[PDB]
Paper text:
RIG-I is an essential innate immune receptor that responds to infection by RNA viruses. The RIG-I signaling cascade is mediated by a series of post-translational modifications, the most important of which is ubiquitination of the RIG-I Caspase Recruitment Domains (CARDs) by E3 ligase Riplet. Riplet is a homodimer composed of an N-terminal RING domain (catalytic domain), CC domain (coiled-coil domain, homodimerization), and C-terminal PrySpry domain (RIG-I recognition domain). Each structure contains two RIG-I molecules, one p3dsRNA24, and one Riplet homodimer, but they differ in the relative positions of two PrySpry domains, which depend on the relative positions of their partner RIG-I molecules.
In the structure containing 23.4% particles, one RIG-I forms a typical end-bound complex with the terminal triphosphate, but the second RIG-I binds to the opposite dsRNA terminus in a “semi-closed” end-bound state, where the CTD has tilted away from its normal orientation while maintaining engagement with the terminal dsRNA diphosphate. This observation is consistent with RIG-I/RNA recognition models in which CTD:RNA interactions are the first point of contact upon RIG-I encounter with RNA, and it provides new insights into the conformational variability of RIG-I CTD complexes. As the second RIG-I in each structure recognizes different types of RNA sites, the two PrySpry domains bind to RIG-I from different approach angles, revealing variable distances between them, ranging from 58 Å to 101 Å. This finding suggests that the CC domains in these complexes are more dynamic than expected (consistent with our inability to visualize them), enabling the complex to accommodate different spacings between sites of PrySpry domains, and enabling PrySpry domains to approach RIG-I Hel2 from different angles. Despite the different relative orientations of PrySpry in the three structures, the PrySpry domain uses the same interface with RIG-I Hel2 in each case. Unfortunately, only the structure of the PrySpry domain of Riplet but not the RING or CC domain could be resolved.
Author numbering:
A (entry chain A): 241 to 662, 690 to 699, 706 to 718, 722 to 923
B (entry chain C): 240 to 661, 690 to 699, 709 to 718, 734 to 922
C (entry chain B): 252 to 362, 364 to 430
D (entry chain D): 252 to 360, 362 to 430
The structure:
Amino acid sequence: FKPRNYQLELALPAMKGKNTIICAPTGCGKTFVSLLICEHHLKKFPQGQKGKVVFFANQIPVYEQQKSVFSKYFERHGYRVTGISGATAENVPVEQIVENNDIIILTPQILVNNLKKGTIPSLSIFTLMIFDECHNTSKQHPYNMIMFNYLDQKLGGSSGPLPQVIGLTASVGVGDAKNTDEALDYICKLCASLDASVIATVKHNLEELEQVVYKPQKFFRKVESRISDKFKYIIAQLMRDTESLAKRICKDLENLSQIQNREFGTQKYEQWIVTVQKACMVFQMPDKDEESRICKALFLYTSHLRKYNDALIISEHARMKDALDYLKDFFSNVRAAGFDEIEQDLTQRFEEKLQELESVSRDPSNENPKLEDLCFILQEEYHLNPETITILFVKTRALVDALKNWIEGNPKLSFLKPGILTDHNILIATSVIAQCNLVILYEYVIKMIQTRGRGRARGSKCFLLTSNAGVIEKEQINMYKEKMMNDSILRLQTWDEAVFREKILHIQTHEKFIRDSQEKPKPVPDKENKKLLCRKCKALACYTADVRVIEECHYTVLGDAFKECFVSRPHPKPKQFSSFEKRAKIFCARQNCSHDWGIHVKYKTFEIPVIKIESFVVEDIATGVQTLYSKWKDFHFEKIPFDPAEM
Amino acid sequence: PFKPRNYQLELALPAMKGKNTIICAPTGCGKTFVSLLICEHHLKKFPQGQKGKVVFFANQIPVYEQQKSVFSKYFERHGYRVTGISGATAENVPVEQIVENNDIIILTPQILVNNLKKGTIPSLSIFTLMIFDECHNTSKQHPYNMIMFNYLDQKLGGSSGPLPQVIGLTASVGVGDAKNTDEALDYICKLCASLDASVIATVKHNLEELEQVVYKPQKFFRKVESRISDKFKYIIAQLMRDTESLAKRICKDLENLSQIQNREFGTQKYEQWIVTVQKACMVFQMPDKDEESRICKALFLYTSHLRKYNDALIISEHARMKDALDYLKDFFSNVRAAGFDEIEQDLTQRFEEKLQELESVSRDPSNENPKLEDLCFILQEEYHLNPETITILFVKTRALVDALKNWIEGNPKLSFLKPGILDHNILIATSVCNLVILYEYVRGSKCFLLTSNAGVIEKEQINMYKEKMMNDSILRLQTWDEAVFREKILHIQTHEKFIRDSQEKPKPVPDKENKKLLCRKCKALACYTADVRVIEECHYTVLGDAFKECFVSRPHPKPKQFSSFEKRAKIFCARQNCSHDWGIHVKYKTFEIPVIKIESFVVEDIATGVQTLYSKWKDFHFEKIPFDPAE
Amino acid sequence: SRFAQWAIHPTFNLKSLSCSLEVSKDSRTVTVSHRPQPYRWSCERFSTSQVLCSQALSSGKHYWEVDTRNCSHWAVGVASWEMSRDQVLGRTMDSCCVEWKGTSQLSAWHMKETVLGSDRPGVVGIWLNLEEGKLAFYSVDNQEKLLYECTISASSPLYPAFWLYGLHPGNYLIIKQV
Amino acid sequence: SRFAQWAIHPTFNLKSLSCSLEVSKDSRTVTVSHRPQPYRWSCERFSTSQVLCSQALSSGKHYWEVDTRNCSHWAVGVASWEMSRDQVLGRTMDSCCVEWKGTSQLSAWMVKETVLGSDRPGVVGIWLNLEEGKLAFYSVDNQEKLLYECTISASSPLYPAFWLYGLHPGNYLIIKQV
RNA sequence: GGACGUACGUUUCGCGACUGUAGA
RNA sequence: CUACAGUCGCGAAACGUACGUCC
Ligand SMILES: [Zn+2]
Ligand SMILES: [Zn+2]
């Protein structure tokens, strides 16, 4: 509640009316500094000038926490705090909410949306912009879009009442740099894109820094992998079988993708499979129905080989039971939707091998040595002190539930209890609170931001498990990279304000020049009506003469027979994004197709099928060439904006 | 001569058995003594009726001459017919006589590739011992690998008679392109398979006896940061912004022409961008032909001046500023004496506006490159200890060697040095003694390494780690069994024979058409493809008389001669301000014809009208008509 | 070697040791691994940082001394053959032992944490008497101070199980003279 | 502290040391850095690895003592303020010194190169008697072995001036009490 | 649906400089 | 002059995968 020099020396240069990239590690202290500079800006106001500041936060929980704290404090001092979330984007006139408040906490995506609209034409309507976590102002961010507007309004030669752009972040980040010279160029570029004449950093309160920082130590763990693998042999036999039997209509598949000799159970094998998938997508037999039948059968073939590769990798990382259950769940999934003779042969073949899988996967000698030594070092930890709640970080969300079930039913380590949040002894989250001193990253190569309150550290362990030298090399380099980014800020601290001013004047003039050169408009749209076909059916479903565009991001189909050429099935997680409410997903309606075409939205009163280009092949009508645009932004055609007046 | 020690027998011994080694002897003429021992022991052991035949490949002409001299001077006593062949010998006493009439041949390997290509020598069965020097260069398409392609294609498959014992003679087997130890083992297996080799014997026992020959100097890294008062870069950025604005005003489509997103002044990326812009604006098609003259000439001139400014910036970031200023001033005197032009007068005026303030900025002790001050600190402080040391300072380009020699000759503090480029104190040499100072390059001697761009330090420390990886993988491979190792390299050789023996169809299709070539910056219509001639598959010339007006020459003061011609003078474009470097003027053997090269030209198609930018006549297709002397 | 010497020098069993250990042919000296050797999967592998002897005990007469230096954290105590594999020593009702803890305390786990001061022995001599249940740890040079006595009325032999912090490569334990 | 004790211990002039040496905040101990540290460049910098003191000398009485331990190759002597700044110490007519050269000699420079024997001092003691124009390097414990004698009757200050080999991070010299 | 950011890995493509070779 | 050759340095495009985040 009371500010120290640990937090007042931060506001000491900021109170002059300048812009800074102050980096504090505390969360409550960062919020205290933002409240401090907001209070200093509000209290300095003469009559004629009142508060019109804006506070940018990125994610929704930080936004709601800041709305709670800023409406809690600045209610007594005669100021009106309002905020904008997803649920506030509709049914209100936005400009009155800009004007009739002082401390608006809106998320930057909706400000970029309203810069597209026309509301707030110049940013003089605000006098302050307070950015949170401004190290994400790297390139093409909405933060960087706002800074593009402010920089071309200040530097452009149309100089008027420009606002201040004081920013705040937690740690600068190295980004895409390997060398300390590029670390300096990165940090100075981050000052340049934010109009930062100064970097404020803690120098005289290093003791108050060292009390609350929570900096624990490295704990890499080093392990050799298995020799006696049977599931790899049986699944390799099934993959030999399925790939060999698949080739009866397609011989040139090895000639059709340029990938070299693939290995069973690697990432490059999945690259091989998806490349031969995109290869066999483009077969163009003039039958157009045997084309459909043949392409559907080989679609079944390559999808099954892909899922078998996923089972291989899951066994390579996690327990054999996890791969077994995942393939069983996949066959239960394919058991629900449709059935074909290719599929019936593959299901009866899987049921043939399934009993041997369930036999050999239940041998306790087939435990993974990575898992064995992981259990070993964990029982070492629980022999050191049995009162440590453990939290883990794995590479992927798939091995989260795998290690949940590794806990669920473990007699050797029965003092762990599941707590998934992606009164809990164990929790596994995948990617980035600090009151439990145990984090275990298993097969995983800015570090983890585990500091929110004004707590303490008192020790921790951070167990990382290694099975290849890649994490060893890259993470020892990365510990040296933490050392040289500390060296990077210690090199930046040895300058003058004027030479930094002309340096950022060079860089800002350069970036203004390049941004003003890069002004390519949209190219000539294709007015040629092309057709679309399903990827797994090769069924003509729609054209480009019946596809609308809502807000230059979304693409709908006006076909009403197209409305009965899919099937609608309600969403497992219905929600909104800026115009809508999701109601359902839609699958392709054929004999046994069940391809995921898109999403079904509720806009005002309709139920509109927003489709995706990812489940589509774009075919010519004049010649008939079936090309494959993967993102909607690269399918250049005559885009027709949306018409609600029709229906 | 010298004397045989113990390790120089230990290295030689695995080849004395009669198996194809790869010797990993370190430098210090131990390898050229070991080759002597192995050649002596091999030739001395044959029975009567037959006799041996050695061939020692060397790669560089001085290394060839040195090994020819020592293999004559060591085996003249025994009565061995030493010889040698290179590119410098004359066409007489042919190779069929020489390899039949000698005992120890020293080739440079392109000669044997030539003879095996044109079928004059049958195959390698006439030889009995091929000694490859610097065998760790056996790679993608190197001449050692071409001879190895022929030797493996004889061995595998249609098995012929006796084949020669390959012996390598590297000094480090080069684990490059590898990251982890398995890939380093893959590299040494790939190389040792590609030489038909089985034993990679190094010294193991008398290692302490070795180190009186080789010596590893201890290193120091001295990273120094850049400048801050970069007024030179500011003024040059001003000039570049101005001329780039002029070029953008006369083009209005410039940022469509290359996909390079972010281009700053004074790197290598800007030079890639300006080259791509030049190659885009050199091809144009718009049916206003005298508009094309102004457009192409203006774009070539602006791009050429921008490229010169970019090179001036690159030179100024690694030397003193006065070197870049002298470079620009020599360039501007070379462009002002060339022609008269509105654009050239505009650029000369815009430079010589800023000229006097630029040279006032350059002639300054404060605006000094701190890298050169750190070098002067090192050279001062080291030579104050041992004033007899000599220094082999390495630099990157050539212009930096000339600039640093000018800098050492022109300094107050550095009076006691006597430089010499490549009796002398230091040697300012790029890519050939107690001080081996590296200037940004990737008893009791030291090896410093100055840099500004961090990452040079990282590449040198990664290279030291790679040497340790090389030693570890050599030691791991030295413990295998020979039979499984022979089978492993037999599978690698078979896989490589299958890959190489499968994709050799770059079949050309002759575009039997007629095209007209244009000048590269003025777009004058030069000649026709129907009137060019291929003389001896090397040179190309225009047998026309209407062409004889379209170029005006310039007399080259000394004459010259080829192997079969006599070059007289250069020739140039006869237009108003083009003066382009087309080619040279030569005589065949009787009369005079102009000979041109495809680098400074475009190929304008007659029918379609499109123009393309070629660089090799091997790349460009047409009716290559052999020249007839009767015309 | 001046009071009552009663037992023989113990010797580690070659089938109830850990997965990690590479105990020498001298068979009174164990040294830890730098990466463990994966052995054959059996139900008699203890799967801990443990190793057991094979000397079946006697009527009442036992005393043995082992070198406990050059180890960060060790654990010496007695255990029966039919003890559960996944359970570590110090977690059962069949154990009396000595524990030089991680927090610089000489504790023990017995039937319960019996903490002493911060005394670290270098060599420990365990004295076992099965006639009346008298047990003594005559460790080193502290006027043969046992400092605690435990009483075990068991029905099985009580083989010394040797535990150590199994994550320090280079650690070694020795059995030496009584 | 047994012969005629006359003079004071000096302090390095921080306007005159070059960019490499980084004399600590106690300000009587000269030490080399790991990498240079860019300070405000003046004309009075050295661009060498040298250092000057601050105190102008006297009529007939000066002496100080310097510890030449912890150094590869060092040189200690005197110099006048009007010294050519880019020039090495001891190679003008403005200086006498003693230098520990590359071939391990106690050489001394009145520019005149005289090699001495292979005795490496730990401690160097400079005695000045400008009343008679005398300068002598009694090292330590040698029953006052003079190790050189040079004559300079200058009209300038003769500050204690030091050179040390500035490429060995960890090289440092100490002034200590008489 | 789409936007953005980060990381891993693969397959090519041109550019500039340095070094050397054979034919003519 | 043709013409291969090996190394270095900086790049640009077409990708798959993994995580998160918002609108
Ligand atoms: Zn369909
Ligand atoms: Zn021309």
